Amino acid sequence: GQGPELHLASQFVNEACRALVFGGCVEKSSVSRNPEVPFESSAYRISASARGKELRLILSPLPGAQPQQEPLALVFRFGMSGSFQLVPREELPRHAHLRFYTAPPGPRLALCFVDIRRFGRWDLGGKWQPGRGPCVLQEYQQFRENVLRNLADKAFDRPICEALLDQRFFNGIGNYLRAEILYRLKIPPFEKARSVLEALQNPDLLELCHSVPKEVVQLGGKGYGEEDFAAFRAWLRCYGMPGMSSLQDRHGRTIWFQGDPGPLAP
DNA sequence: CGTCCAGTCTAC
DNA sequence: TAGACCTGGACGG
């Protein structure tokens, strides 16, 4: 996922788990190379928050829960095929790699981290990844200042389309978003990042890094039924669209654009 | 059947 | 900077 998908997953976990109580341990698939989650409680509530491309679950035991346990935090990155689903306990999806089980009374459900390709990860810490910059969705002002204050950094030597994926500065921006952001301003994708950003300090490029992803969030849906995908496909103006050019950036990722490739094109 | 296509993370 | 990590769907022979 990118920022909007991670944000919508966090809203999903919060709304779906709102009136649920989990009990038991946290079960991992045998094939997952991520860590076993050392957690058990007779009664715990799960809630979520998103920051850029990361999602933090908090497991919160109720008063009196046994074994005595402090709340535990987990941070997930989704990679290419991560998601959360709420399913019936005995109809787990095929790649449900981490599950939380509701306690009785009611229908035994499973909250599942589902990741087909297993590019996603989780850590026990609870900390956000050091080096990821502020969330373009929820920390706009911190995100904007973190870029403008560091334009000397070598990251800004690269083409703008490459700098937009560097999660140190654009935490939450991925491939469709970089295309859609640059198309709104008709910025050539191989314009130099420092050139485009130096021309700041008018919705501008950094503002669009917040407002474009926010548009996706306001669509709703995107896994969180299938008509939700036509909603998103209709919103797109550039990424994958007939009549648009594509190039490979230097890390082999496809950038979609209109017109001028830009000076630093391969 | 085969190939090609869809974000880190780590070794050189 | 180049390959490593994975599965599945579209599509071509």
Residue numbers in the entry: 2 to 202, 222 to 244, 249 to 290
Paper quotes:
Human endonuclease VIII-like 1 (hNEIL1) is a bifunctional DNA glycosylase of the Fpg/Nei family, which catalyzes the removal of damaged bases and subsequent incision of the newly generated abasic sites. Unlike traditional enzymes which are commonly referred to as highly specific biocatalysts, one special feature for hNEIL1 is its unique capability to recognize a wide range of substrates, including formamidopyrimidines, hydantoin lesions, oxidized, and dihydro-modified pyrimidine bases, derived from all four canonical bases. Here, by integrating structural, computational, and biochemical investigations, we show that hNEIL1 uses a triage mechanism to achieve broad specificity and reduce futile repair of normal bases. This mechanism involves two mutually competing interaction states: an activated state that commits catalysis and BER, and a quarantine state that temporarily separates and prevents the flipped base from catalysis via auto-inhibition.
While we also crystallized the complex structures for more lesions in this study, we were unable to obtain intact substrates in the active site of hNEIL1, presumably due to the residual glycosylase activity. Hence, we introduced an extra E3Q mutation to the truncated hNEIL1(C∆95 P2G) (see the “Methods” section) and succeeded in the determination of complex structures containing 5-hydroxyuracil (5-OHU), spiroiminodihydantoin 1 (Sp1), (S)-guanidinohydentoin (Gh), dihydrothymine (DHT) and dihydrouracil (DHU), respectively. Despite the very different chemical structures of these substrates, they are recognized similarly by hNEIL1. The damaged bases are fully extruded from the DNA helix and inserted into a relatively loose binding pocket, which allows the accommodation of substrates with varying sizes and shapes. One edge of the flipped base points towards the protein and forms close contact with the side chain of K242. Noteworthy, across all these structures, we observed an unusually short distance (~3.0 Å) between an outwards heterocyclic nitrogen atom of the nucleobases and the terminal nitrogen atom of residue 242. Based on the similar overall conformation and detailed atomic interactions, we conclude that such a tautomerization-dependent mechanism may be a general strategy for hNEIL1 to recognize not only Tg but also 5-OHU, Sp1, Gh, DHT, and DHU. Moreover, it is expected that the bases with less solvent interactions (e.g. DHU) would favor the formation of a stable quarantine state compared with the hydrophilic bases (Sp1, 5-OHU, Gh, and Tg).
